[PDB]
Enzyme design. Structure first.
Site, PDB file in Angstrom:
ATOM      1  N   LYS A   1       0.855  -1.177   0.000  1.00 36.37           N
ATOM      2  CA  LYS A   1       0.000   0.000   0.000  1.00 36.37           C
ATOM      3  C   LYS A   1       0.900   1.240   0.000  1.00 36.37           C
ATOM      4  O   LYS A   1       1.382   1.651   1.058  1.00 36.37           O
ATOM      5  CB  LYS A   1      -0.923  -0.020   1.224  1.00 36.37           C
ATOM      6  CG  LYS A   1      -2.235   0.728   1.062  1.00 36.37           C
ATOM      7  CD  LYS A   1      -2.082   2.200   0.729  1.00 36.37           C
ATOM      8  CE  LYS A   1      -1.629   3.011   1.919  1.00 36.37           C
ATOM      9  NZ  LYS A   1      -1.529   4.443   1.572  1.00 36.37           N
TER      10      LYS A   1
ATOM     11  N   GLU B   1       9.764   1.534  11.173  1.00 39.22           N
ATOM     12  CA  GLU B   1      10.670   2.660  11.011  1.00 39.22           C
ATOM     13  C   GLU B   1       9.861   3.949  11.195  1.00 39.22           C
ATOM     14  O   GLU B   1       9.053   4.310  10.345  1.00 39.22           O
ATOM     15  CB  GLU B   1      11.310   2.578   9.624  1.00 39.22           C
ATOM     16  CG  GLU B   1      12.105   1.300   9.389  1.00 39.22           C
ATOM     17  CD  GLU B   1      13.536   1.338   9.902  1.00 39.22           C
ATOM     18  OE1 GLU B   1      13.909   2.347  10.520  1.00 39.22           O
ATOM     19  OE2 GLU B   1      14.269   0.360   9.686  1.00 39.22           O
TER      20      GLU B   1
ATOM     21  N   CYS C   1      12.794  11.658   7.954  1.00 41.73           N
ATOM     22  CA  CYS C   1      12.809  11.045   9.300  1.00 41.73           C
ATOM     23  C   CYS C   1      14.073  11.485  10.054  1.00 41.73           C
ATOM     24  O   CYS C   1      14.028  11.711  11.261  1.00 41.73           O
ATOM     25  CB  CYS C   1      12.738   9.521   9.221  1.00 41.73           C
ATOM     26  SG  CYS C   1      13.774   8.771   7.929  1.00 41.73           S
TER      27      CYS C   1
ATOM     28  N   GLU D   1       8.413  15.729  16.924  1.00 41.42           N
ATOM     29  CA  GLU D   1       8.810  15.763  15.533  1.00 41.42           C
ATOM     30  C   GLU D   1       7.940  16.770  14.773  1.00 41.42           C
ATOM     31  O   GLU D   1       6.730  16.754  14.911  1.00 41.42           O
ATOM     32  CB  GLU D   1       8.662  14.381  14.901  1.00 41.42           C
ATOM     33  CG  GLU D   1       9.045  14.363  13.432  1.00 41.42           C
ATOM     34  CD  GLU D   1       9.021  12.987  12.800  1.00 41.42           C
ATOM     35  OE1 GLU D   1       7.968  12.320  12.897  1.00 41.42           O
ATOM     36  OE2 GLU D   1      10.061  12.591  12.222  1.00 41.42           O
TER      37      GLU D   1
END
Lengths: 511, 507, 511, 507
Positions: D179, D258, D292, D401
């Site tokens: 996906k 991750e 990231c 973040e």
């Protein structure tokens, strides 16, 4: 390079490759098509010792920048070589049939091994793992790194003119070494071309130097002697045990650890419970692939007493069906000519030695000629040196049993039970390849742990090693070095152990 | 008999488990005090070494078929036995080769560490499963024992260095013939007996005592020409190693050769000076400079040269020397043997002849030529003045290994010159740099040609679980200790198994 | 600790071990000798959630100095533990027979696994290898290091009260982690003693904390819940699939990768060509070792049609000869009691489930009592919970076939040919152990690559894994984690990738 | 149709090799210019994902039995095909996710590097041969494929990051349902087609397009509860990852997760200041801070704080921003999607509310609020002012973040405080320190809690052959790339083989 037109292609003339430059220096040799000696494949020079010396010093020069080229970039050169070899596979196949006389099928496989080796070591550029290791002390760290050795001298036979050199050249350059290569005088054109493909792939000039010439009393011998002058940090050899012993000696006094891939007298056992037709096919192919001119060709078929007579009968029927001929004109043949006159000469003598010690000749009449024709020969048997398929019955302890004989010959020996099959299988000075055909788990196991060999096949031929397993022999067949896969990295690097202190004080280990 | 500092032991060779008192009698005298006779023992002739190799061949059959984890259990027993005997072996080592109790304990501890490492290696020895390119086929690799291993060892590390060879050799299923240094026959005999107590079968380890050149050592090397050894391992001089490599080479043996060093230690302008002085000092005078890894040359960066020299000579002047059995606080004791003493005496003559500048040292310590920090009677044995030169690159003192308490200072200017000078020797064993600049440590680390490099640490004192060995004249690529030694004592066996009931042609 | 005199030894009372101190806090539980419930082995407390919390914070405290203790020194502690375990092996053996009711032979083996594990990880202190890796850039170096995770929560069953905990505790502390351990309430004394042996070996206080108590609605559950409070960086569990699923869920939302060693329904195949007496012995031992209370105990014997009747007959003869009894008074018995009432209860119900779905009961009459005696029982069967050896014939797809049942029971199933044997062998939710008895190389091979299991035996039992192979299961039997050997290091460390620049400039990777 | 800067592509799902245009139509607009419609594509419903997983289960049977070296040959073909298509994929990536041509080429190159690495891994995948403790018995380990792998990926690295999962997954003999991010559907479709051209059998890779929450992504995660996945791999936010870990956990799946980062970059008093400024700048504004691994906090040693700030703001002021398809010299372009834009807008409000000091940045770049070094029309898409704060540890800007072009400066005093502050985040992905003192680099390296640490290098730019992943909120222990990812896509099978014809009881 195209000096003349030949019979089945151009006659090429070319020189040595030193520091990227072509050097036409030394007395001219020639290589004739062994299937048809009217076809002159190549004219090329014999490098004298001083030119080999210069090639090693050019290698030493180039090594400085190549060893400092990041391994992943070195791997990208090999990746280019994969694609270039792929592109050239049909051309290299045809040239190999012409220059060493193996079948198109076998020649394609020979080239494919170099492609497989190139791919394997292309990504090895992002591996080459060393270790991080915990110190026994606080504020201290331990490391190991693989370092290149320096300049590698490589001398190779010509029975596998692309594959076998690729096993040495590729990991040697990937690990950051530079190379001087003395190819077999049986395959100078293939060798020149292979060097040029490395160049096209982006290998810097001087990282690979090629010096053509002979062996004893010629370029090969001179190159071995240069170990005494400190010009080689590594040596790698594929060839006869006799020459290997000398190379090992010279390497030894110069504190070099050489790769020595030497001869075989490879046993193939057939137990009473074997699939007989599979075992016959395996024995047949073990014996007559490349006309019996492989290191791994079967030397002795050891047949369990209860199936001896039945195996012999089917084996001789299968041997009788062997096609032989010029594989460039008849690509359907099992095998073609002897690669050179040396192999032919030694093979001719094995008949006399066999008769003298009382071996029983079951099949074969020596050289195939117009006068001594072979029923399944295709083409003109006098245009080259071709051999009758040859089958003996022999006893252990005889010369035909213990000594390697290149060419299309094989012995049958009767054994009784697994213990005797193993003892007889180990009764040669050699220890390269080996095989057993059986269905009893326990028998396969005992052979596997009882044999003394670098390589063992269960219900498979003594030939046809996969390109990503460790290849090499024990006893007279080698010194412990292995080629292919991760196992060859020990051959072309050394371990550098590093300890780093941060504790600002002298800490005494194990005290 | 009773000796001066202990018993005088008499003993013979160990062959097939039996003690064999056969051959002309040799003796080992305490090098700190020649009046103390440590051992009387025989010189094995070539024919007895031949028998030892054949006894080894015999025992190998059952030992190689002993499962590796059971072989590991023998080494586990050896750990415990070595542990129990550590104080005894320490005392005997001080007596027999003259190193300090502290260093002797460390020597024994290396054998304990090696034993433990290879005890669990019995449940490892990993080979590989590998995917075939064919359906219905599987690929395998296995580690196999080589056969009978010939081992010849020096005596400067009489327990540690032999343990690096003996232990992995037997763990990997080999059998051994061992010719120990004539400097450490008692330790060697005892070590063999501890292996026996641990449960090592008789004949898996055979010990033949004697000399080297023109004696048992030489004869054992010659037996490679008769096919009696499948492996050879040597620790000693480069000159002898070259010959052993030659003999091994023609017999298609891959030998382990751990040879000499001329180990460079660099001190850059930014170093912690007192740390670097201490490290240089210890690199030089540990074991009285009788280690393969002892510093050969201190390469000092120009801007700190004068200041480093001054502090270095102050530190060297404080060195205690003496009989370490009577004065265990000494830095070092005697020469281990007369050969090291002789070659050390010659280095003074060669130094003067080529114009090296002698900063400190007056040769042999005697009643007539006393050393201010000597403890005890310097005439009971062979003891050496700490010795410091200034030398130029390219000279014999700079390039040639000299066992004993000596060291050179050399002036260098900048990292590039330090590396070039550090590499200007025939050798490549150990190496070191004292610096704080990451970039300088890095360049030394990738520019040096050496098996081993220390950053802000001595050239000596390698940890027992890193690969040990050298390049150039220091070795042939083989490594001892850890996983890296397994290549020395086994070979790869590649096995392919077909199930597809038809002949599939590879590539 | 010696609170009273018991029947076959002392009744010990003891508390939790937190930060090195013994803490007698919480409601008292007791452990009765399952062979004879008159013998009270131990009285010990149930740690409440707040005390487990404190144990985890004490672990966090101790982890700081332990993780900075050099791995080779940590290994020396384990080396001491080898010697101490060795010294205590007879004592631990006897205590284990008393506390969980396995035979002296099996109990000694249980202890030996901890000794083998200790030795393996003792020298792992000088290994723990990471990698040095070549950069794609000049003047740059790459490294990997194994780092400890932090505080490890461990919950264990009691069927292997020393071995199975040692598989977790030992590598956990060797890799520099600290531990909170909730032992099975079936083996509190062994667990306490094991902790004390770690202490004697030199493990610093607080590196191992032990909190006793139950599971659901008790200390176990509370400890799992503390993952939600950030107190555990790792969790390791041995027990039922049902509980494992929940632990995996809690671990998952807290980004912990848990070790989950769960149940089995282990198939053992016997092909037409098997050594029948070997296969019978292997099936028998697979079924009735530890009274069928192993994760790896055989669930289903799949017997090839042509030998079905003959195998059944010999198997029932062998099952009939099974000795059962109090192994402390009769050490020659094959098995003793159920370890606890839960296993007994579920086993009793399997008879009702079997009858309800139409399984055919060949042998077994449920609980062994004075009223329902077993002909080869030794001693008093009412002093504890003991089970009749039990054999069914079942169909695939039934509950007896698919569901794990601890205790002395086994099913026979008829299969026809290798393809069907494999399909039926895979027709459970489980995938822990497996076995095939055969002599045809090709059949062993197909089973080996067709089975879905963590572990496969060829001509050997489903039980008896060697201590240095990776242990674990797939499907309902586990999540991919493995214990023992080098394979467990992934469970208790994480990879730290480090890149070091020396080039004094910003070099952009892959650009 | 034809679009503004290329074709508007329409395409469907790829299931069992067939293209399936089924579900409500979604579209992806060029984030640099909303007028350019890149793709129209459907949203797969849960039942179609179910079918994709069953098609994967079907194809797995033959693919897992395809020899690993032949599987590797497919990846080798993929290397060459990716090589051929690199300029095309680069241009399409600039268009579809708005990163610069230079960065897009690097993104594609990571997939090429991954392909090459795993091409030869087909002839590796080593398991072990292990010695039994018993005679006449042998032990083996083999790596086996897990089965059907569910993969969900973000779109900030639309080729690289998916290649880290897809390639090793198929090489190890698994089959895949993928996906992709709705931010990069075209790249994903094309990548699947290149796999097909390379010779990957139909159904080994199935691609189902759609959204995440309340859409295809969520539905695919839920299917773990129906037993249709033997493995799951996710790259994205921590919040989503926690849920995926939970679902995976109850289904006894070990997932690759991750997740996010708040990556610290330390600058010590002795750093090369201009190198550190350049590294901090690039760590912050590469991909417009949408990695990231983008720097979260620059921790600057007190003695150089003022001087570093000054040079850092000068370097930030020089940042070019714009449509990278029309101006390929820009440092960064638009936000990849509206979610990142929205969360970035909120960080300004949260910053002001908690008293962070805004040094530079005025929010969205518009005609009315222009940026001096913007190239082109800032209203064609969502573009952000480079943003710099000073913050205190423990605040939301410091710990949380924030994707997009923002960075914080924090003052620290000495190495101990730098490490403690560097670890004061829920995250542990990447990290960096600029220093010249060996001891300081060392302490940071062993004191940080992070999957990845750079010394004198950016927090971004991980090499493709090191293990990639994080600890704490950044991941669960799994690693991608190199040999370390093989644990993610295979399981260990231990096999013992008896030949002794009798039952031998272990331990």
């Amino acid at each position: 390079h195209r000096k003349a037109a030949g019979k089945y292609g151009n006659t090429l003339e070319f020189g040595h490759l030193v520091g990227g430059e072509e050097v036409l220096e030394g007395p001219l040799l020639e290589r004739r098509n062994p299937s048809d000696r009217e076809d002159v494949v190549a004219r090329f020079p014999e490098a004298d010792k001083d030119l080999v010396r210069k090639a090693a010093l050019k290698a030493r020069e180039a090594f400085a920048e190549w060893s400092r080229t990041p391994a992943p970039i070195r791997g990208q050169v090999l990746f280019n070589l994969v694609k270039i070899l792929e592109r050239e596979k049909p051309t290299l196949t045809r040239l190999m049939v012409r220059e060493v006389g193996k079948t198109p099928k076998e020649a394609a496989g020979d080239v494919q091994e170099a492609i497989d080796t190139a791919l394997f070591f292309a990504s090895e550029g992002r591996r080459l793992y060393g270790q991080t290791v915990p110190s026994e002390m606080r504020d201290k760290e331990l490391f190991t790194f693989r370092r290149p050795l320096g300049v590698v001298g490589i001398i190779t036979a010509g029975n596998f003119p692309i594959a076998v050199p690729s096993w040495k050249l590729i990991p040697a350059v990937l690990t950051g070494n530079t190379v001087v290569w003395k190819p077999s005088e049986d395959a100078p054109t293939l060798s020149f071309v292979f060097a040029k493909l490395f160049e096209e792939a982006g290998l810097p000039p001087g990282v690979l130097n090629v010096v053509f010439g002979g062996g004893k009393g010629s370029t090969g011998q001179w190159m071995v002697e240069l170990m005494d002058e400190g010009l080689f940090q590594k040596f790698a050899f594929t060839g006869s045990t006799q020459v290997g012993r000398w190379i090992g000696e010279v390497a030894g006094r110069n504190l070099i650890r050489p790769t020595l891939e030497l001869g075989g007298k490879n046993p193939l056992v057939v137990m009473r419970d074997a699939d007989l037709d599979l075992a016959v096919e395996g024995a047949w192919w073990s014996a007559f692939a490349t006309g019996g001119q492989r290191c791994t060709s079967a030397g002795n078929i050891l047949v369990d007493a209860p199936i001896y007579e039945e195996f012999k009968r089917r084996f001789l029927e299968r041997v009788e069906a062997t096609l032989v001929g010029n594989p460039l004109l008849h690509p359907e043949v099992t095998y073609g000519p002897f690669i050179n006159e040396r192999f032919f000469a030694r093979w001719q003598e094995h008949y006399r030695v066999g008769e003298a010690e009382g071996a029983r000749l079951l099949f074969g009449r020596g050289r195939i000629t117009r006068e001594n024709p072979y029923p399944r020969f295709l083409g003109d048997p006098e245009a080259g040196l071709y051999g009758w398929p040859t089958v003996w019955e022999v006893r252990p302890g005889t010369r035909l049993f213990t000594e390697e004989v290149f060419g299309p010959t094989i012995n049958l020996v009767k054994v009784d039970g697994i213990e005797e099959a193993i003892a007889v299988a180990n009764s040669t000075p050699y220890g390269l390849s080996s095989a057993i055909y059986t269905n009893h788990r326990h028998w396969a196991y005992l052979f596997k742990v009882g044999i003394r060999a670098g390589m063992t096949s269960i219900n498979n031929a003594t030939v046809g090693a996969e390109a990503h397993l460790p290849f090499g022999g024990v006893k007279a067949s080698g010194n412990g070095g292995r080629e292919s896969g991760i196992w060859v990295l020990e051959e072309y690097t050394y371990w550098h152990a590093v300890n780093e202190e941060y504790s600002g004080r002298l800490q005494l280990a194990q005290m």
